[PDB]
Design a protein around this ligand. Sequence first.
Ligand SMILES: [Zn+2]
Lengths: 67, 357
Amino acid sequence: KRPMNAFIVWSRDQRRKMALENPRMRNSEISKQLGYQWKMLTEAEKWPFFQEAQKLQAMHREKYPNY
Amino acid sequence: KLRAVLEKLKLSRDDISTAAGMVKGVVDHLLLRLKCDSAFRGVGLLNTGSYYEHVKISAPNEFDVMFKLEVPRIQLEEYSNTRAYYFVKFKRNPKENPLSQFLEGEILSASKMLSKFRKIIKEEINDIKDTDVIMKRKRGGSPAVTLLISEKISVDITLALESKSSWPASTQEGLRIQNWLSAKVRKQLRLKPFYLVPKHAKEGNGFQEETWRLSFSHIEKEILNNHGKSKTCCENKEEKCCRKDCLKLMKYLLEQLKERFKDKKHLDKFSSYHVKTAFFHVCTQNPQDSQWDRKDLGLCFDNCVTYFLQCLRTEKLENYFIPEFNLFSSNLIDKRSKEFLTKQIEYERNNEFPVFD
DNA sequence: CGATCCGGGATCTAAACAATG
DNA sequence: GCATTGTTTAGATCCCGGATC
Ligand SMILES: [Zn+2]
């Protein structure tokens, strides 16, 4: 499995904590709202997620020579 | 597997572009200043070698440029029973053939004409000052004028005689490519002229040097650039053949080995022609595109090694165009160098050719 | 000539790929 | 399996030297 880019690392938690409070059964609408939210965060609000994705590929790129 | 080794052999696009630029600039001016009623007036350019055949490796620093002469009505007398070296005689007296000043008696001076040829070149390379040019000394035997441009880019120029007459008796059973390519292609290919280049090195007493060597370098270029049993092999991504890739790595194998033994030792004195001729017989016995699938890169390579190994193991590799002529004849190479060569490859083959990296 | 078109190194565009009910 | 954003590559386009008439 290709490592999780900063969007997926951020999208796994928010979709859950939204679908609990929101009553939308479809994930198509919920994902549209997540992309709406990720496109509105500040670069400082997104930097730690980039650091996390770098640490993800840190032990997936030099431990698995496949891409 | 070894597919990554090719990336360390691809010529830089800017390297070939700048190198061929200065090479063309010297060649055209040299060719332009040539052909001034020295019977050279009809010299033509013939592009041969590992570059124009798209098998050049490492860096593009060497070129194989051939100058041809359309000398007509030539009668050839076979030298001894060599089946490859020939006297250039003239069929009839009346026409006053252009190279008549180079006629000794009834044989053509392969030495006087070649020295005159180098004379015209050495005169005019000095005059041009656009590019630094140094003429390498004629190497003992070498029939070629080796020019050295500034910072490598060596150019090997071989004066050749074009003969639009039919091929010889020696080539009658050669070019056995009927199941491969076509029997129709062979006829189409045989009608094309054959060329005459001065003999490359000493053999025998060292005199009677008026012998000439047959050259089918243009033939090797055509079948390499149209190499598939089906006409569209390599036209599309589907069914891309590995043919060129096999003798490419083969040339890198031997090229790599010659450098390795830089002790002025053995395994020397045989060029890529043995690799190219061996790969030629490989494609003969493998006349199907299915056998040369791209996925089986290591397999078709291994089959090409196998035939080279067997050519070594049998100690006989005949010229493709001339069957009797043996490039692995006992006179040409001692059996120990084949023992030398087979020792390496077999080690390198099982141990994955460690000299590549 | 030069007009054209092919082969191959160079470079681009596109779709597939990751987590998720 | 839907719809998002980012990364990665391969399937494709571009570009140029050679070549034949
Ligand atoms: Zn092919």
